[PDB]
Structures are given as C-alpha cells and as structure tokens.
C-alpha cells in the first residue's frame, strides 16, 4: 500500500555508487537516470542516491535488520568500516556508517 523511498543527496555520483554498493553488497535495482540509483532492500523499503551536491552529506537513514553481524562483516570484506559502534545495556547495537559526503547510515538490531 506504500513504497518508502529513503533518499540521500550525494556529491560525486561515482564515489557514492561505489560506496553504497560495497556497504549494501548489492547492485542498484535500477537507475531512474544517470546520476540516480535505487536499491530495493525489501518489499516497499527502498534506498536511493541522487547527485545533488548542494544537499550532500546531511542525510540520515536507519535500517533495523535481522542480522547486524552479517551487515558488519560483509561490508568489512568489501572494504567499508563503521564510523561508530554503540552497544547499549541490553546488548542491542547501533552501528553508524559515514558515506563519502558524510551522511549517516545506521544499522541497528532487535533485542
């Protein structure tokens, strides 16, 4: 009933596309145009980057996933590390990535 496209403005499209590819470990589901890439993460939950340098590096998106460890290690092997790891009392982690422009992509998990 609703498709949520979470957007991120980026500076250099190529650098951003490379980085998001590594992080997500998937290729864009499609390109609406030449400086725009959309990933379908799941049904009705999509992430897109677009070249709008005047807004780049200010975005914040959070994904709560089933397997945080997989997100972590998979991104590590493809060469991207987290900026910060917060472990709260219950052991629930939030880990934050910074894209090439400085936007924050966080990944959390359930207790």
Automatic annotation (TrEMBL):
<feature type="domain" description="VOC">
    <location>
        <begin position="1"/>
        <end position="110"/>
    </location>
</feature>
<dbReference type="InterPro" id="IPR037523">
    <property type="entry name" value="VOC_core"/>
</dbReference>
<dbReference type="InterPro" id="IPR004360">
    <property type="entry name" value="Glyas_Fos-R_dOase_dom"/>
</dbReference>
<protein>
    <submittedName>
        <fullName>Glyoxalase/bleomycin resistance protein/dioxygenase</fullName>
    </submittedName>
</protein>
<keyword id="KW-0560">Oxidoreductase</keyword>
<dbReference type="GO" id="GO:0051213">
    <property type="term" value="F:dioxygenase activity"/>
</dbReference>
<keyword id="KW-0223">Dioxygenase</keyword>
<dbReference type="Pfam" id="PF00903">
    <property type="entry name" value="Glyoxalase"/>
</dbReference>
<dbReference type="InterPro" id="IPR029068">
    <property type="entry name" value="Glyas_Bleomycin-R_OHBP_Dase"/>
</dbReference>
